[PDB]
């Protein structure tokens, strides 16, 4: 029987449907259980690098904080007497043995603290950013989606030798609906493995899926994400956060 | 001293809508604000010109070292290029000289060098975008 | 147990209208079957995994939504593709004599 | 791999235990009891009847408004005597 | 769009292949080589190279021009004006029309601003909306508004067609309530009494020409029919309207919610309203 | 002579380690979320500076306003003096002003 999904949100009128293969992990040659409809405006946006580029250094920075630091020459243990006089010793004029010109002495211009380079692109922004890398994806043939990430057994091999027989890529990014709800089976498979990396739905993010060469979805993974991102389009500028209560909002 | 009750609808009118309502059908039209709902079906035109979330065109002016003046038509999809000899078409009669424009395909905007955003919104509602 | 790789190259097959249009009636009828819609999600499967298991090579997702009709399948079943590696298709492309390659990896 | 439990808001009221010097003082105050209250209804186990002044709260309430918001009658006294002065 | 088809022809996008948009970053200057180095833009020797210049405004000794000129009372008492955004006839018009603002329900600054149809600032002295007679000509909405303030010819054009408008005050507390309940039932407190208008604000919400609130609702038909022949239209008598229900509905000048009473606490979490009891916090909210 | 002589150690580097393999996951915690926490929630380091930037001057004076009372006797004089010294430089020296 095979595994159809529809659009659930309206689509635009000008715009059709994009599709792709519903897959299954239970066997080597089960590439096709089924045809999804992935909503156009989700998975065939514009393709927008810039944008790529503006979250995924965003998501490398938001974060970083630097903690390199060093001792000007008021932090620099003593230092407090002028060396020699002005005048009458015949060398340079100091006015303590921990200036910059010093070895020894402070730093004039290093760095400072533990520095934040904190900053948030609208929401908008990366919620676009997350739309263009699906695109990506999907354009560029590493999206596969899957009825289920249920597999036979919990060998990594098995996982790794029908990645290789499908030929995905070196790296693989599956997707799960919720933490909690994840197969066993794959959860096991893996945990052993490095290049194959399980995250739940709300763990999608454009750095590990450029970072990874395949991105595997569930079909509920990929509801999921298509109602989230098309939420951000047509909503209403915010009168304060969302995590507060709204008439329609979860 | 604490009475509950169950007169919660009065706090459910309070709660603000997230998403932006779909306008409510009109007898008549153009509404009475002069907003007009695209027709259905689109039109078969290379390009189309969605709506921006609010549903009106994405006919915007712009302005820059206070002298600048454009306008920008933003939310293009499809051939921008037709759009842009379109655009061209309609609006030297208006200058006497062929409008100066620019067309970032990659942000799929059409730019163009003076002030046209009524008429560009009054040609685009004609054109049923 | 895993089956071997199997190779992408794909060369159309010389009964390729015969075989689509015997798919398609089995599928779906009316005159001009290449103009026959796939809008269907139903019919656009089936008949596409029946070519797929046919002739061991399947659509891929981004040419997927472009499959708006039996032509467009057609014209996708009647390109060939070849999986040799660039080291195959620089040496056997007739270097002259003077032209020596070599592949360390 | 896989990926750590996502991060989640610590579900229920929050209650910091007073006796502990480092809880912040905002943080034990019956503010953040109502708003404890106000965040998750009967589950934050305060008493609702506290959410209202006490006696002595409700008088000096009545006491500022008594003293700084004057009664619509009283302003339309005080108007009218300016009016007629004006006049 | 052949984007994508171009897409699928190229290698993979990956984190070796991105790059900002071209004119988005600006090269970094730094005083490093021939250029940029030796004064490294700074000039020759002085106060401004040594970078003491002194502070901005300082005219090296002549009386600074800013110091020059008179003191006047141009923003004296600016924090203590009453602001109020103007909500033109115009920008009604258009939130009816896209249904952002519902005339079927009485409209009040809460249904404007769920609606976006206006941003109130109670923490910037923001009043409430006043009414704005611009769009007054095309305005062809029956409607029951309830504003802060509002000009003679929006509520001319508000009731020829049909509707009703009042004029209603909002202290800064009941303002900011209003305009965002959701964060004020959070807070967990009971609804607060909306304070009266202060003295000098008393007279306009008691005239019935302004619609006021507070004003003799036996004069309300004499005003009505005032601006009907002034502006040369016909009253339509709203009592035979088959909304004369909603039109009538105005809040008590003490509620700031049109159907929740001082007092009561808004428990959100289980969708309930505890209402006190006791006789002195009875009195107290009803004062 | 400023130059080794010898090729350095060669540097391995990991790049499928746990770190570098979930690096970024939650990033749009938010977005994905229903809001419920903000993604600069997610940011681990000093108490004064989590989801906030600001200049030297301001790094300094949140420092101080936030774990001024906590900072050891020299480090919280450093501070101090650091805080001073970035006042007269910000507000009464450069090109511009
Ligand atoms: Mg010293
Ligand atoms: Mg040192
Ligand atoms: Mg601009
Ligand atoms: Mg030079
Ligand atoms: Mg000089
Ligand atoms: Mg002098």
Known sequence: ?250 | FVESVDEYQFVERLLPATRIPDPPKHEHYPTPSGWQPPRDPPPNLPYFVRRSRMHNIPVYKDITHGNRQMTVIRKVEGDIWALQKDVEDFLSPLLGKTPVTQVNEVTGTLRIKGYFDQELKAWLLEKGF | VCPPLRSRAYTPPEDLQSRLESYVKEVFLPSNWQDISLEDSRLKFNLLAHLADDLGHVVPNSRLHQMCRVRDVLDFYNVPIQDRSKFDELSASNLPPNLKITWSY | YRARPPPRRRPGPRWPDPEDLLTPRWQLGPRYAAKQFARYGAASGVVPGSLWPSPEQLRELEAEEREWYPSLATMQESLRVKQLAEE | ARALDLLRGLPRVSLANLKPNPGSKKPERRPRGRRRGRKCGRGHKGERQRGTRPRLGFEGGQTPFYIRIPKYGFNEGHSFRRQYKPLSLNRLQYLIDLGRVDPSQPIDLTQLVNGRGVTIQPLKRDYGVQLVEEGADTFTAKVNIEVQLASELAIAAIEKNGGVVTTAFYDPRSLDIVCKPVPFFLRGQPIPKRMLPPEELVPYYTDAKNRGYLADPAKFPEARLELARKYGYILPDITKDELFKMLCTRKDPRQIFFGLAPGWVVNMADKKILKPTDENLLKYYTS | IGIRLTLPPPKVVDRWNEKRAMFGVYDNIGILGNFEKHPKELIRGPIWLRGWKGNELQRCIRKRKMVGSRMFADDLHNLNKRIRYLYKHFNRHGKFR
């Open chain 1, 1 to 250: 029987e095979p595994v159809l999904r529809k659009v659930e949100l309206p689509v635009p009128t000008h715009r059709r449907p994009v599709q792709a293969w519903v897959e299954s992990l239970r066997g080597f040659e089960q590439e096709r259980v089924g045809l999804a409809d992935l909503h156009p405006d989700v998975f065939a946006t514009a393709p927008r690098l810039d944008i790529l580029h503006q979250v995924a250094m965003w998501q490398k920075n938001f974060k970083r904080i630097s903690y390199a630091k060093t001792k000007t020459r008021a932090e620099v243990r003593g230092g407090g007497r002028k060396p020699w006089p002005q005048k009458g010793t015949g060398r340079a004029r100091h006015g303590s043995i921990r200036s910059p010109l010093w070895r020894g002495g402070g730093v004039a211009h290093g760095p400072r603290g533990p520095t934040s380079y904190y900053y948030m692109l609208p929401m908008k922004v990366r919620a676009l950013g997350l739309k263009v890398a699906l695109t990506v994806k999907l354009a560029q043939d590493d999206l596969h989606i899957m009825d289920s990430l249920e597999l036979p057994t919990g060998d990594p091999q098995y996982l790794t030798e029908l990645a290789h027989y499908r030929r995905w890529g070196d790296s693989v990014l599956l997707v799960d609906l919720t933490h909690e709800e994840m197969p066993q089976s794959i959860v096991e498979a893996t945990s052993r493995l490095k290049t194959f990396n399980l995250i739940p739905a709300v763990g999608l993010n454009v750095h590990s899926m450029l970072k990874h060469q395949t991105l595997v979805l569930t079909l509920p993974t990929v509801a999921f994400l298509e109602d989230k991102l098309l939420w951000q389009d047509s909503r209403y500028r915010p009168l304060y956060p969302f995590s507060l209560p709204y008439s329609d909002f979860p």
